[PDB]
């Protein structure tokens, strides 16, 4: 009657983030005496009684400072959902984790047979630059630099574009995610680069000003 559905292993590039679909079941006498349902996600081998959750729906249980903000229980706990959202991954998060349910004095149980093995890899993916593809001189167009599979989980990502085609403008307006520019002819073929840090990921593109 105590079942938990979840893929056993998971992977994420450092700094990025992933969602772990999870479902769970437990016996419920189901009558009016309906006490609160509390769920926890702990690190492997920690004792429910004395550990800080990596994630929990209990508003009294303290959460591991390291996982606060990055490990969140998506979906509805009252609806078999134990899905875990893991953001701004860290090599440190690498490890095993188990899920626990507690409801009333009767329902108490750790799903020790279904641990979640999270593995954090090194960040390879580089940012992205998007636009309409006009590339006409004397015609301003905005660019959108963004990193794939990222969450607004941890500390925001700092932008900064580099290039010779940036001189014809204010060094200030060169920190946003988006950016406009009236491309010049000397900018055509220029090497522009968008950098990102969470408070070495670069994307350098040759400008095609027609
Ligand atoms: C079965 C049920 O209705 N709920 C039990 C649960 C479940 O059997 C268990 O969660 C399934 O994984 O066990 C409860 O007691 C356990 C709990 O106190 C944990 C806390 O650490 O310890 C468990 O025993 C440990 C033992 O202390 C260790 O020395 C050993 O290395 O591992 C054991 C686990 O295999 C207790 O069984 C629970 O609430 O989790 C009591 C529920 O009634």
Swiss-Prot record:
Residues 170-191 are annotated as: Disordered. It is found in: Membrane. Residues 127-206 form the Ig-like C2-type domain. It comes from the Eukaryota. N-acetylneuraminate binds at residues 100, 108, 110. Disulfide bonds join 17-151, 22-82, 145-194. Residues 1-117 form the Ig-like V-type domain. Glycans are attached at residues 81, 191, 208. Expressed by monocytic/myeloid lineage cells. Found at high levels in peripheral blood leukocytes, spleen, bone marrow and at lower levels in lymph node, lung, appendix, placenta, pancreas and thymus. Expressed by monocytes and neutrophils but absent from leukemic cell lines representing early stages of myelomonocytic differentiation. Contains 1 copy of a cytoplasmic motif that is referred to as the immunoreceptor tyrosine-based inhibitor motif (ITIM). This motif is involved in modulation of cellular responses. The phosphorylated ITIM motif can bind the SH2 domain of several SH2-containing phosphatases. Putative adhesion molecule that mediates sialic-acid dependent binding to cells. Binds equally to alpha-2,3-linked and alpha-2,6-linked sialic acid. The sialic acid recognition site may be masked by cis interactions with sialic acids on the same cell surface. Belongs to the immunoglobulin superfamily. SIGLEC (sialic acid binding Ig-like lectin) family. This is Sialic acid-binding Ig-like lectin 5. It comes from Homo sapiens (Human). The lineage of its organism: Eukaryota, Metazoa, Chordata, Craniata, Vertebrata. The gene is SIGLEC5.
């Amino acid at each position: 009657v105590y079942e938990l559905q979840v893929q056993k292993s998971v992977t994420v590039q450092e700094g990025l983030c992933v969602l772990v679909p999870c479902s769970f079941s437990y016996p419920w006498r189901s009558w009016y005496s309906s006490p609160p349902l509390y769920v926890y996600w702990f690190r492997d081998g920690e004792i429910p009684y004395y550990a800080e959750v990596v994630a929990t729906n209990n508003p009294d249980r303290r959460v591991k400072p390291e996982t606060q903000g990055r490990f969140r229980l998506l979906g509805d706990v009252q609806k078999k959902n134990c899905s875990l959202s893991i953001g701004d991954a860290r090599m440190e998060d690498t490890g095993s984790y188990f899920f626990r349910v507690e409801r009333g004095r009767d329902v108490k149980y750790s799903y020790q047979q279904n641990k979640l093995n999270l593995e954090v890899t090194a960040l390879i993916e580089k940012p992205d630059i998007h636009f309409l593809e006009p590339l006409e001189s004397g015609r301003p167009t905005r660019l959108s630099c963004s990193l794939p599979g990222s969450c607004e989980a941890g500390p925001p990502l700092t932008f900064s574009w580099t290039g010779n085609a940036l001189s014809p403008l204010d060094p200030e307006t060169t920190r946003s995610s988006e950016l406009t520019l009236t491309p010049r002819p000397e900018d055509h073929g220029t090497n522009l680069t968008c950098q990102m840090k969470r408070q070495t990921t670069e994307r350098t593109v040759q400008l095609n000003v027609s």
